[PDB]
Amino acid sequence: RMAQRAEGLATVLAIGTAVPANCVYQATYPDYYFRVTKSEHLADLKEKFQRMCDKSMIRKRHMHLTEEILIKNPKICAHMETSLDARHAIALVEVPKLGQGAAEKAIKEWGQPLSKITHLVFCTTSGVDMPGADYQLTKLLGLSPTVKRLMMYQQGCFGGATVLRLAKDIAENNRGARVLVVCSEITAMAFRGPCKSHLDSLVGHALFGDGAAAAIIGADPDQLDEQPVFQLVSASQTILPESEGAIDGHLTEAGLTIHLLKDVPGLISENIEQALEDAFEPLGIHNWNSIFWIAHPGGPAILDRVEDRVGLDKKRMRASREVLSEYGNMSSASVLFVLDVMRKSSAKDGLATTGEGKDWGVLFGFGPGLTVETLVLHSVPV
Amino acid sequence: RMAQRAEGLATVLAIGTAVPANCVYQATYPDYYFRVTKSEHLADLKEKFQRMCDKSMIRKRHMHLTEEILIKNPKICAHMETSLDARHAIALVEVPKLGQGAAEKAIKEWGQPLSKITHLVFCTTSGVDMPGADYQLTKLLGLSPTVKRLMMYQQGCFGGATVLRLAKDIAENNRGARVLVVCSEITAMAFRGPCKSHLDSLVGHALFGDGAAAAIIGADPDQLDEQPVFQLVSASQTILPESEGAIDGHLTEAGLTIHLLKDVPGLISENIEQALEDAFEPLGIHNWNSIFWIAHPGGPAILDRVEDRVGLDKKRMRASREVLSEYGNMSSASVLFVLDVMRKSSAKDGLATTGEGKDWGVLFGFGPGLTVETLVLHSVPVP
Ligand SMILES: CC(C)(COP(=O)(O)OP(=O)(O)OC[C@H]1O[C@@H](n2cnc3c(N)ncnc32)[C@H](O)[C@@H]1OP(=O)(O)O)[C@@H](O)C(=O)NCCC(=O)NCCS
Ligand SMILES: CC(C)(COP(=O)(O)OP(=O)(O)OC[C@H]1O[C@@H](n2cnc3c(N)ncnc32)[C@H](O)[C@@H]1OP(=O)(O)O)[C@@H](O)C(=O)NCCC(=O)NCCS
Ligand SMILES: O=C1C[C@@H](c2ccc(O)c(O)c2)Oc2cc(O)cc(O)c21
Numbered sequence: 209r210m211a212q213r214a215e216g217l218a219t220v221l222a223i224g225t226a227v228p229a230n231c232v233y234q235a236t237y238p239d240y241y242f243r244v245t246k247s248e249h250l251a252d253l254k255e256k257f258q259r260m261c262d263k264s265m266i267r268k269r270h271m272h273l274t275e276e277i278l279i280k281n282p283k284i285c286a287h288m289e290t291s292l293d294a295r296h297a298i299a300l301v302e303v304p305k306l307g308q309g310a311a312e313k314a315i316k317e318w319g320q321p322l323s324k325i326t327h328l329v330f331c332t333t334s335g336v337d338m339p340g341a342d343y344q345l346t347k348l349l350g351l352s353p354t355v356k357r358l359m360m361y362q363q364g365c366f367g368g369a370t371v372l373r374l375a376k377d378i379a380e381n382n383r384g385a386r387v388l389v390v391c392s393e394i395t396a397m398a399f400r401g402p403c404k405s406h407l408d409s410l411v412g413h414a415l416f417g418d419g420a421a422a423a424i425i426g427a428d429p430d431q432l433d434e435q436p437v438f439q440l441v442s443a444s445q446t447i448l449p450e451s452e453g454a455i456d457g458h459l460t461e462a463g464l465t466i467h468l469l470k471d472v473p474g475l476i477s478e479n480i481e482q483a484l485e486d487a488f489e490p491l492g493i494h495n496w497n498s499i500f501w502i503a504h505p506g507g508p509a510i511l512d513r514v515e516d517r518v519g520l521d522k523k524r525m526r527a528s529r530e531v532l533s534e535y536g537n538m539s540s541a542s543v544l545f546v547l548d549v550m551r552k553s554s555a556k557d558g559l560a561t562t563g564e565g566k567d568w569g570v571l572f573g574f575g576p577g578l579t580v581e582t583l584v585l586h587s588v589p590v
Numbered sequence: 591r592m593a594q595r596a597e598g599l600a601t602v603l604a605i606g607t608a609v610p611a612n613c614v615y616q617a618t619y620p621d622y623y624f625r626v627t628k629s630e631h632l633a634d635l636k637e638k639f640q641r642m643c644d645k646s647m648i649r650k651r652h653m654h655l656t657e658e659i660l661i662k663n664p665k666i667c668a669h670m671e672t673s674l675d676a677r678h679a680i681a682l683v684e685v686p687k688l689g690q691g692a693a694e695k696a697i698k699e700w701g702q703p704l705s706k707i708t709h710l711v712f713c714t715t716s717g718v719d720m721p722g723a724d725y726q727l728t729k730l731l732g733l734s735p736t737v738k739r740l741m742m743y744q745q746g747c748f749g750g751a752t753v754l755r756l757a758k759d760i761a762e763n764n765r766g767a768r769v770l771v772v773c774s775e776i777t778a779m780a781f782r783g784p785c786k787s788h789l790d791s792l793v794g795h796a797l798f799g800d801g802a803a804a805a806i807i808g809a810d811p812d813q814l815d816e817q818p819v820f821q822l823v824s825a826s827q828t829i830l831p832e833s834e835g836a837i838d839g840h841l842t843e844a845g846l847t848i849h850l851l852k853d854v855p856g857l858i859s860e861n862i863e864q865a866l867e868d869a870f871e872p873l874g875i876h877n878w879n880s881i882f883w884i885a886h887p888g889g890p891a892i893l894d895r896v897e898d899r900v901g902l903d904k905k906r907m908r909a910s911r912e913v914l915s916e917y918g919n920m921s922s923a924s925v926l927f928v929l930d931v932m933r934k935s936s937a938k939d940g941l942a943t944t945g946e947g948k949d950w951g952v953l954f955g956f957g958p959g960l961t962v963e964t965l966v967l968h969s970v971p972v973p
């Protein structure tokens with residue numbers, strides 16, 4: 209046992225990302241969306257959608273779904289028609305394929321042979337199948353058949369935090385263990401026509417985009433061969449009081465359907481300081497401007513209300529807001545995009561650490577429950 | 591870090607199980623199945639199904655699905671009609687509820703307060719939802735809102751092995767950590783009428799039953815308060831060569847569909863010796879009759895072919911075959927039923943350990959990939 213376990217902290221050794229090539233600009237999206245769903249006669253609905261897109265703080269999203277795919281699948285353009293099989297035909301292929309894109313880039317940065325990967329954690333909100341996307345990606349990359357797999361299906365936007373909590377325990381309990389984590393999301397599971405009865409669906413079509421992110425996680429990194437980017441210090445999870453039904457996601461005959469309440473920004477902002485204190489008081493840290501921030505960019509209102517309630521300088525949420533701006537909400541993938549933006553912008557602006565010159569960092573995932581996942585991170589020098 | 595980690599091996603401290611009260615005897619099942627699915631005109635198919643049930647070595651299965659629910663959901667009795675929403679309406683409620691049945695029993699055996707549960711791992715092959723069955727069970731039991739949850743959806747028959755591998759890393763890496771693992775399966779997601787084009791579906795309807803199992807796992811058990819049942823020593827996983835497509839499961843508009851190939855018993859039995867060697871060589875163990883066996887009772891053919899290829903005395907597979915006989919194939923839940931049957935029958939037969947008087951044990955999960963999961967277990971003494 210004592211020799212079978214690793215000594216040091218789980219560490220991010222590499223981060224890769226990938227998006228579908230197809231790029232849709234938010235400025236023109238209300239016109240595109242109402243046109244391709246043949247709903248331009250719903251003028252009030254379109255005006256309401258225009259206001260959502262205008263306040264979204266999203267410049268662009270990447271989307272596998274094109275007009276050509278939508279023309280060949282009219283049932284996906286309707287609001288609530290039988291479409292799961294046509295959606296699965298796309299997503300069961302594209303999720304592992306996008307995850308392969310991200311995984312290759314993480315593996316290239318890491319630079320070790322594929323044989324060294326002992327574990328794979330695959331996380332999606334975008335379809336389910338047996339064998340899983342974990343199997344499909346093992347085959348796509350040529351991992352060892354003895355790779356130990358965890359397939360995290362139907363996770364939602366805290367899935368990015370969940371895979372790091374998982375990778376943490378695996379890497380730290382297994383000497384030599386190197387964990388590939390991959391989060392991959394394709395909105396083709398959820399894309400539908402607008403309807404006046406489901407205004408929360410409209411909000412989802414303003415925010416959700418496609419992407420995948422991959423990291424290599426290991427404890428006791430090699431001095432010459434491996435380059436630490438972040439350390440994973442602790443992982444917590446909580447269900448917020450009075451939050452029942454705030455975020456529901458159903459996999460139906462009509463595909464993936466979302467049920468968002470307007471209260472979500474309020475519920476998270478009202479509970480975030482208790483989450484900070486439970487994570488940081490044991491480390492004697494109390495100044496929320498003295499830590500770097502990896503906040504799941506769920507939407508501008510979440511970031512705004514957390515920033516306001518906690519008292520953050522605008523710089524703290526910059527990396528989260530860049531991911532929201534450049535990619536939208538990519539569910540489980542987003543927080544790894546934020547981590548990657550933060551370490552790259554920190555090096556480019558010649559700061560002292562991978563976390564904007566600070567030592568300690570917080571990573572937040574938010575999703576159904578309502579669930580808040582809190583990870584304490586530690587930066588490494590540049 | 592050296593402070594936040596536990597010292598000893600992840601240990602099973604309690605096991606509870608639960609099944610739907612509705613009990614379907616296999617002897618009469620061909621008549622029930624062909625009748626409730628209004629398929630009595632398919633005489634050849636029914637004769638083939640009669641032979642499958644007769645060779646199944648299953649005496650009974652528990653099924654949430656009753657005739658009354660089938661009459662109110664005709665689309666589920668068809669082979670391949672749009673039915674996912676009706677299936678989900680049953681399974682998204684009954685999976686957590688059956689898991690709560692098993693979890694309550696494990697928690698009663700354990701005897702510690704619910705507040706001591708730090709982590710929950712929920713596994714199913716029976717429907718998906720957000721929030722998950724993990725959330726629903728947290729609510730049903732009244733676990734702490736700070737419980738750290740892993741929701742293992744669409745896992746298949748190796749899920750029972752997977753949750754123990756997960757609990758092992760969590761319990762050993764987190765001082766004080768007590769992990770509730772729950773596997774819960776409801777065949778309402780998969781139940782359908784027979785079709786001459788899908789004979790593997792027929793095999794499923796002969797073997798799969800409903801059930802849930804729960805265990806409490808922790809490292810460094812408390813000397814006065816907690817009594818170990820098994821230790822989790824190692825966990826391995828492999829994709830068998832030349833096995834692509836052997837076991838597929840699709841969640842469709844028509845519910846969960848299975849795609850089994852006849853080679854499955856062959857593929858597993860041909861690779862099991864290498865899996866035993868990879869797990870036990872490092873411990874210097876070579877005699878497969880000197881260890882206790884927790885084999886996923888996927889079907890009589892898998893147990894028969896492994897027993898023959900490995901050279902096992904009939905005694906080794908007794909606990910696996912009892913679970914098959916008394917419950918059928920309960921997917922991810924089955925191996926925990928087998929662990930529970932082994933420790934209970936070992937105490938009843940006044941044997942020296944929880945593993946039929948042996949010290950070392952092997953637990954196998956099998957499922958899509960084709961994936962074989964191999965855990966080394968260690969028994970504990972029995973007074
Ligand atoms: C939608 C959003 C991007 C812009 O809205 P905003 O900054 O609050 O500005 P407004 O109040 O002008 O809202 C614009 C429109 O969206 C509507 N809206 C916002 N959230 C909504 C919700 N959950 N359900 C329904 N409508 C909603 C408003 O009613 C308004 O419609 P109207 O102008 O026709 O009355 C912002 O509300 C947001 O960040 N919310 C989503 C956060 C969230 O729930 N994330 C989920 C992660 S799973
Ligand atoms: C189903 C089972 C109980 C039948 O008993 P058996 O000893 O194989 O007996 P038989 O070979 O006579 O099988 C009975 C019938 O089932 C058919 N059958 C068996 N496996 C089949 C499969 N995978 N697909 C289609 N038909 C199958 C046989 O061809 C035969 O049809 P017939 O009687 O008209 O000739 C047995 O095959 C079994 O245990 N299967 C292994 C379990 C499995 O593959 N899945 C595990 C769950 S993941
Ligand atoms: O309902 C959903 C949609 C889902 C999603 C799917 C595919 C994507 O590419 C994507 O960006 C998002 O995201 C969700 C995330 C949640 O936290 C809750 C949900 O209900 C949903």
Ligand SMILES: O=C1C[C@@H](c2ccc(O)c(O)c2)Oc2cc(O)cc(O)c21
Pocket residue numbers: 338715716746747748775776777778779780798799800801837838839840846847848849919920921956957958
């Ligand atoms: O397709 C399936 C069915 C599934 C199952 C669901 C619900 C139950 O109660 C149950 O006992 C089984 O079991 C499977 C197990 C597998 O390993 C693969 C599958 O495709 C399936």
